[PDB]
Write a protein that binds this ligand. Structure first.
Ligand SMILES: Cc1ccccc1S(=O)(=O)Nc1cc(-c2ccc(C#N)cc2)sc1C(=O)O
Length: 558
C-alpha cells in the first residue's frame, strides 16, 4: 500500500507565489536579515512528494486491539447530532475555497439557494453511493519559515459542497468524541495555561518523572486504510442518526480512505491511500490514531505509568523513570512498536528529565515570576517561526494573521510582549486600524478578533500575571537572544522605547485602547501600574475556543 501513486502531472499553483520575503518601509524595524525568511511554494512540491511517498506495513498485536476495544467502549457513551445544512453553512470560513459547481463560501454563509441546493444533492449522493471515490484537489501550501529550506507541505481537500456535508455528518462527532475517548490526554481541550497545568501536574504525579515527545515521520502518510477504517469503527460506536451513520460510512469509503488527486489546472496528479490533510476528520482522526498506537506501544514497551498528551500527530509521553539506561531501552522498544504500527519516527525520541526541555506542539513549559515574586509556569516556544511570519505580515496582508494568534497563545512570553505587541500595535496605531477585526487561527479553527480586545482575551486565558511576568529563565532568555541575533532583530532598548511611545499613544486614545496601553505595555515603564481585572472581559464568549482541534477542517467561528 503506497501512500501515493503519481501520474507525473505537476502540483500547480493557483496564483502567483512569492518565495522571498517582501520588504516595505516597516520591514527593517522588525528584522534586518531578510534572506533568512522564505515562503514555500509549489516549486518544491516535487521534493515533498518524494518524501511523503512510501509503502506502509502494519503488524497489529493484542495491545493494539485491547486499547482499541477500550476506546470503542468509551466511544459508545457518545451521542452526536446531525447538523442542519444552515448550521453547517455557518461554520464555513468567509474565504474558504469556492466550489467547482458555481458558488463560493459567501454564497454558503448566506444560505444562497444555489449553494444549499447543491449541498443537498451532494448529501443525497453520499447516502445513495458508498463506493465512488470523491475527487480532491492537491495544492502546495505557501508557508513562511526561517532557513535551516523545507519543501512545501501538501494540502488535499474535497469540494466545498462535500466539506459542508462533512460538518453535517461529523462536526458534532469530532467536536465531542475525542475528549470522551481520551479524557485528560486529549490536548485540544486545553488553553495554553491549562496545557502547562496538565503537564506540570502530570510531571509532579510521578516519583521519578521522565518524558519525551515522539515525532512520527510524515504522520499523514503513515496512516493506512486499516487505520482509517478503525477510525470509522470508532465513530460508528456513537449513538447516531441513521442518516449520519450512512454519511460517515460513505465519506470513509469514498473520501477518507483515499481518492484521486487533481491539481489546480484540472489534471489528474495521482492517487492517495493515506490521510487527506484537508478534511474535517484530519485532526480527530490523527489524534485518535496517534493515541491508539502510542497507548498500545506504551504497553508493548513496558513503560511504567505512561501518561500521554496528544494533539493530532503531536505526541508527548510522561512516565515513571527506571534509570537512564532502562529508559533508553524502553523508548527504543516503544519506537519499534510504533514502527510496527506504521508510525515510524522522524527524529529518534530521547528521554528527558527536565520538563522544560520537552517540546510538544512546538512548545514547552518554562517559568517566570509574577508581580509577587512567585514562580509561575507558562507556555512558550522558539520565536523563530513566529518572527519570520510576523516579518512577512509586516509587508503583506494574509488570510491568517499569525502575529495575532501568537500574541493570544503566547501572551506571557518575553518575545511576544517585547516584540509582537510593540511592533503590531505601533502599526495599527499609525494606520488607525485598532478596531478592525482580523482573522487568525487557534487549533486550526478560524476566528475574527479585534486587537482592542486583546487585554480581555489575555486576562481570561492567561490571568493577570501575563502582564507582569519577569525574571524569565536563563534557557528562555538565551533562546530569545540567539533568535534575535540570527534574524537581526533590534535589542531590548529599542523595543522598550517603542513600547513607551506606543503605550503613551494608546492611553491618549482612551477606552479599550487605553486599556491596551495600560496592561500590554506595563513592562516598558519603570514605575509599574496597579493592573487589576477588567469588566468587559466576562462579556467575551470564549466557549468553543479550546474544545477541539480542526486543522485542515475548514472551520470558522464568529
Ligand atoms: C518583563 C519584560 C517583558 C517583555 C519585555 C521586556 C521585559 S524586561 O525588560 O522588563 N525584563 C527582561 C528583559 C529580558 C530580555 C533578555 C534578552 C533579550 C535579547 N536579545 C531581550 C530581553 S529578560 C527579562 C526578565 O525580566 O527576565
Amino acid at each position: 500500500s503506497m501512500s501515493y501513486t503519481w501520474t507525473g502531472a505537476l502540483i500547480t499553483p493557483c496564483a502567483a507565489e512569492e518565495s522571498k520575503l517582501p520588504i516595505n518601509a516597516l520591514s527593517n524595524s522588525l528584522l534586518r536579515h531578510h534572506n533568512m525568511v522564505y515562503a514555500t511554494t509549489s516549486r518544491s512540491a516535487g521534493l515533498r512528494q518524494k518524501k511523503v511517498t512510501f509503502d506502509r506495513l502494519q503488524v497489529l498485536d493484542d495491545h493494539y486491539r485491547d486499547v482499541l476495544k477500550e476506546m470503542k467502549a468509551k466511544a459508545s457513551t457518545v451521542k452526536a447530532k446531525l447538523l442542519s445544512v444552515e448550521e453547517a453553512c455557518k461554520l464555513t470560513p468567509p474565504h474558504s475555497a469556492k466550489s467547482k459547481f458555481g458558488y463560493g463560501a459567501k454564497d454558503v454563509r448566506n444560505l444562497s439557494s444555489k449553494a444549499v441546493n447543491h449541498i443537498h444533492s451532494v448529501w443525497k449522493d453520499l447516502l445513495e453511493d458508498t463506493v465512488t471515490p470523491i475527487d480532491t484537489t492537491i495544492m502546495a501550501k505557501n508557508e513562511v519559515f526561517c532557513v535551516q529550506r523545507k519543501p512545501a507541505r501538501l494540502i488535499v481537500f474535497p469540494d466545498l459542497g462535500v466539506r459542508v456535508c462533512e460538518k453535517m455528518a461529523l462536526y458534532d462527532v469530532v467536536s465531542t468524541l475525542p475528549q470522551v475517548v481520551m479524557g485528560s490526554s486529549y490536548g485540544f481541550q486545553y488553553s495554553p495555561g491549562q496545557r502547562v497545568e496538565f503537564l506540570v501536574n502530570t510531571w509532579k504525579s510521578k516519583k521519578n518523572p521522565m518524558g519525551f515527545s515522539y515525532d512520527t515521520r510524515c504522520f499523514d502518510s503513515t496512516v493506512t486504510e486499516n487505520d482509517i477504517r478503525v477510525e470509522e469503527s470508532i465513530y460508528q460506536c456513537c449513538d447516531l442518526a441513521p442518516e449520519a451513520r450512512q454519511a460517515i460510512k460513505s465519506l470513509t469509503e469514498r473520501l477518507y480512505i483515499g481518492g484521486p488527486l487533481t491539481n489546480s489546472k484540472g489534471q489528474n496528479c495521482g492517487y492517495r491511500r493515506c490521510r487527506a490533510s484537508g478534511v474535517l476528520t484530519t485532526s480527530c482522526g490523527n489524534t485518535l490514531t496517534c493515541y491508539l498506537k502510542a497507548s498500545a506501544a506504551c504497553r508493548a514497551a513496558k513503560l511504567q505509568d505512561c501518561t500521554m498528551l496528544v494533539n493530532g500527530d503531536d505526541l508527548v509521553v510522561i512516565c515513571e523513570s527506571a534509570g537512564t539506561q532502562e529508559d533508553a531501552a524502553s523508548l527504543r522498544v516503544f519506537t519499534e512498536a510504533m514502527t510496527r504500527y506504521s508510525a515510524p519516527p522522524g527524529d529518534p525520541p530521547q528521554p528527558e528529565y527536565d520538563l522544560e526541555l520537552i517540546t510538544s506542539c512546538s512548545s514547552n513549559v518554562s517559568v517566570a515570576h509574577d508581580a509577587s515574586g512567585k514562580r509561575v509556569y507558562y507556555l512558550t516556544r522558539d520565536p523563530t517561526t513566529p518572527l519570520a511570519r510576523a516579518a512577512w505580515e509586516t509587508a503583506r496582508h494574509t488570510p491568517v494573521n499569525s502575529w495575532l494568534g501568537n500574541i493570544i497563545m503566547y501572551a506571557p512570553t518575553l518575545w511576544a510582549r517585547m516584540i509582537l505587541m510593540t511592533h503590531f500595535f505601533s502599526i495599527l496605531l499609525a494606520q488607525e486600524q485598532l478596531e478592525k477585526a482580523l482573522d487568525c487561527q487557534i487549533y486550526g479553527a478560524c476566528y475574527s478578533i479585534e486587537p482592542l480586545d486583546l487585554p480581555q482575551i489575555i486576562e481570561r486565558l492567561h490571568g493577570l500575571s501575563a502582564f507582569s511576568l519577569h525574571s524569565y529563565s536563563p534557557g528562555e532568555i538565551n533562546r530569545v537572544a540567539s533568535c534575535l541575533r540570527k534574524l537581526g532583530v533590534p535589542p531590548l532598548r529599542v523595543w522598550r522605547h517603542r513600547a513607551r511611545s506606543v503605550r503613551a499613544r494608546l492611553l491618549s486614545q482612551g477606552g479599550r485602547a487605553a486599556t491596551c496601553g495600560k496592561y500590554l505595555f506595563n513592562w516598558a515603564v519603570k514605575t509599574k501600574l496597579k493592573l487589576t481585572p477588567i469588566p468587559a472581559a466576562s462579556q467575551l464568549d470564549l466557549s468553543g475556543w479550546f474544545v477541539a482541534g480542526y486543522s485542515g477542517g475548514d472551520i470558522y467561528h464568529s
